[PDB]
Design a protein around this ligand. Structure first.
Ligand code: HEM
Ligand code: HEM
Ligand SMILES: Cc1cc(N)nc(CCc2cncc(N3CCN(C)CC3)c2)c1
Ligand SMILES: Cc1cc(N)nc(CCc2cncc(N3CCN(C)CC3)c2)c1
Ligand SMILES: C[C@H](O)[C@H](O)[C@H]1CNc2nc(N)[nH]c(=O)c2N1
Ligand SMILES: C[C@H](O)[C@H](O)[C@H]1CNc2nc(N)[nH]c(=O)c2N1
Ligand SMILES: [Zn+2]
Lengths: 411, 407
């Protein structure tokens, strides 16, 4: 089958053939689209076809499909599976896997960079202390004094689901949130639940507005242990505005390194439940979402006051005006401090080029329009006018439940 | 089978029981979502009529009543006999309001029950259509206090006697492909403008020429008519702060009136059913003015603001975009023409959505279209999960008449 996508700004039409290699489900049906829904221990039975599907793809990619090496590897994996009920990936396969999981991430606008990913193999890790060390090394490497480098660290795969490695933090670096008895929130409201756990686990909270959370690290299905990332490894950027001098006095800063740590990495049917990965920020993540979401730092009001906008009626677009200025300040600050960041105009333009390239050389590029379009100024970016097809390819990054909801406590 | 939608800003969860009454298809499959794609006989007819009559009689609390059965019978006899059937005035109005109610891409549906329906099924000629359309324009415009309206022309018979409004909106500005290679007026309307010229229109080759109506009656050849200028309410665009903004020479019309869709009710097809409400400000200032393939004025405005247009990271585009939309809202409000900003409108949609879930079991919604084209995440709709599905009565897309016209 052929599927066409049109860009309504340029009339450029592209033809998808890659969707035929789609596997997993979308959530949608012929009667309902679930396009805007955030979120819609394996047998050897299901395991070898998934292993084989993956190895066929790997060996095609290296132009060795049907080779003796290809055939031997299949044979080798088949037996390891029937002997031991699972199998081990070669380093090459692991690196290929992780790069492709990112390449396949339909919600990621930054995918033009997918082939440049530093893969850290942490499959020899056995304890939370070992995890802490690997994660420190990842943070130092990825930060690179502000010249950020994409990286992923891969801890041992799931076995029986009873010995999972998990990073309990949703991101490696994030600020605490503290709910006050008066109902107000100190710090990042997003992180109140996790902060409470940390405190419960023994963390001494400074109770400031921008406290870097400790790492809560779980190895081999044991109870998680707390660790503090050395502060010297945590690069932060004081936020100021190039024209408004009062902006610095808001007392805002943000960390440089966005590093997702709660997702599951699936490769050839194997499940890596601890796989922190990091790139660099697109400005709107901080300036639009982190600062201006009503459920986050929520600073539109205070910024708007200081700008003396007309705040009596929404039709003054005071919220819109303040939002822009804040996003200007975020970009200005990172650039001024030589910390890697990308504006939404740049990142969406690059994505369109990436996407067209992927259609030509790959037969498609699965993309989630809902996530790809930036949270401000949507239609003045080229992705808004771009039809996209969303489908699931493996290897992939998947959501998994939060560990505190599933963990069987040892005590 | 019962579905939940969550609002990630408020944690409010709603349960959709209404999608189970959807019949038409989304374009999506288990393997591929097409949520962002813009365009995804007597035996056929009676169950469609029945489905509709059933929901109609349910609405007036007379389900399984004698009148219900009688009507069902009557319509059945009539299809058996005539191969179609005619809607009672009450059913036409109910159906039109519900077509709007079911429009999953429409953010303004909180107004759905307050829609003035003009029955033009007695129309036979294009001159008759022109008269009805002028009356609609005048009624809906109402000196600037806009009132939603729809005018419904005769239903399709054999597809060779179609009534069609060839225009996409009752009121739009012409577009001309220049020898300078650029484009004068609205680039969106080049093709239509040419057809107007090929059909006789004398273009005043300006930048904001209100297009003539091109009207097709009973499947016959389409005719040109010019809307009385005094019925077309336009608004000069000025900025409350920037004195220079007026020099751009920008204006827009007050009445958004979609004229190219198909109204399906009880299996019957109304190929000519122009409808109108009032603008949300972003439709003009974000899309009509700042879209690259439209008036595309971002650069001119940014220059007049003397912004650093060297690097994209200065967000000069974003700044001009906000100001432009400020001016649009300011101009309309200053001239007392009804308009709604994207904050007010989305806030209304959330309340409508909650009303609908509570009193109907759901509200089909297309997030890709409901979220405004600027400042998306600072509006409540961004954080709102929506389920998209197709209910009837409905407004459907249909082919442009000129690809299908047997001249
Ligand atoms: C290089 C710079 C990168 C940029 C600028 C970038 C940008 C983004 C943005 C803006 C999002 C949407 C999340 C949100 O806005 O809330 C996203 C999502 C995502 N990114 Fe990237 N990204 C980058 C690197 C990476 C890397 C290295 C990986 C993995 C190896 C990755 C994998 C993903 C995945 C799996 C999602 C989906 C998250 C979810 O489903 O919640 N990205 N990215
Ligand atoms: C009264 C105030 C109204 C407002 C503020 C409003 C707002 C909107 C907006 C912003 C859109 C997105 C379309 C675009 O951006 O091009 C839309 C779509 C739509 N509206 Fe409403 N509208 C109103 C009245 C109506 C009425 C009276 C009807 C029908 C009786 C209607 C039917 C539709 C339909 C069918 C669509 C989808 C059109 C398409 O798919 O191209 N609207 N509306
Ligand atoms: C590697 C990377 C780079 C970047 N610029 N942004 C991101 C996404 C940031 C992000 C922020 N908040 C939330 C999420 N997701 C992650 C997955 N999590 C389970 C849900 C929320 C992701 C990731
Ligand atoms: C009644 C009404 C009110 C309003 N504020 N906006 C609209 C939609 C405006 C609009 C602009 N451009 C295009 C479309 N649609 C019309 C149907 N057309 C076939 C596709 C594009 C609609 C309609
Ligand atoms: C309900 C809706 O899907 C939800 O708010 C989505 C919308 N698009 C998004 N896009 C990005 N990049 N990140 C997000 O968290 C979301 N949230
Ligand atoms: C490709 C994409 O679906 C297309 O640009 C859509 C996106 N959302 C939209 N939303 C509205 N309200 N109006 C539009 O024209 C569009 N265009
Ligand atoms: Zn879908």
């Amino acid at each position: 089958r052929f599927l066409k996508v049109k860009n309504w700004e340029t009339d450029v039409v592209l033809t998808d053939t890659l969707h035929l290699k789609s596997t997993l489900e979308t959530g949608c049906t012929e009667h309902i689209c679930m396009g805007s829904i955030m979120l819609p221990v394996r047998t050897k039975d299901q395991l070898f076809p998934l292993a084989k599907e993956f190895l066929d793809q790997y060996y095609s990619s290296i132009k060795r499909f049907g080779s003796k090496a290809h055939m031997d590897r299949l044979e080798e994996v088949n037996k390891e599976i029937e002997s031991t009920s699972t199998y081990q990936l070669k380093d090459t396969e692991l690196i290929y896997g992780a790069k492709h999981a990112w390449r396949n991430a339909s919600r990621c606008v930054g995918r033009i960079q997918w082939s440049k990913l530093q893969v850290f193999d942490a499959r020899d890790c056995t304890t939370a202390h070992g995890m802490f060390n690997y994660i420190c090394n990842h943070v130092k490497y990825a930060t690179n004094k502000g010249n950020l480098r994409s990286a992923i660290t891969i801890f041992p795969q799931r076995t029986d689901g009873k010995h999972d490695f998990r990073v309990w933090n949703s991101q490696l670096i994030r600020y605490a949130g503290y709910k006050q008895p008066d109902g107000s929130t100190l710090g990042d409201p997003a992180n109140v639940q996790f902060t409470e756990i940390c405190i419960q686990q023994g963390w001494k909270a400074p109770r400031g507005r921008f406290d870097v959370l400790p790492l809560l690290l779980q190895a081999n299905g044991n109870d998680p242990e707390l660790f503090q990332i050395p502060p010297e490894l945590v690069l932060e950027v004081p936020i100021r505005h190039p024209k408004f001098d009062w902006f610095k006095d808001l007392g805002l800063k943000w960390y440089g390194l966005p590093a997702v740590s709660n997702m599951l990495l699936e490769i050839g049917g194997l499940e890596f439940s601890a796989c922190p990965f990091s790139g660099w920020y697109m400005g709107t993540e901080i300036g639009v979402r982190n600062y201006c979401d009503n459920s986050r730092y929520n600073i539109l009001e205070e910024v708007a006051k200081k700008m003396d906008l007309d705040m009596r009626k929404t039709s003054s677009l005071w919220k819109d005006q303040a939002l822009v200025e804040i996003n200007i300040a975020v970009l200005y600050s990172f650039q001024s401090d030589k910390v890697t960041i990308v504006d939404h105009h740049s990142a969406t333009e690059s994505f369109i080029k990436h996407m067209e390239n992927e259609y030509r050389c790959r037969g498609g590029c699965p993309a989630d329009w809902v996530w790809i379009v930036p949270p401000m100024s949507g239609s003045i970016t080229p992705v808004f006018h771009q039809e996209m097809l969303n489908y699931r390819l493996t290897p992939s990054f998947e959501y998994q439940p939060d560990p505190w909801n599933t963990h069987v406590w040892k005590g």
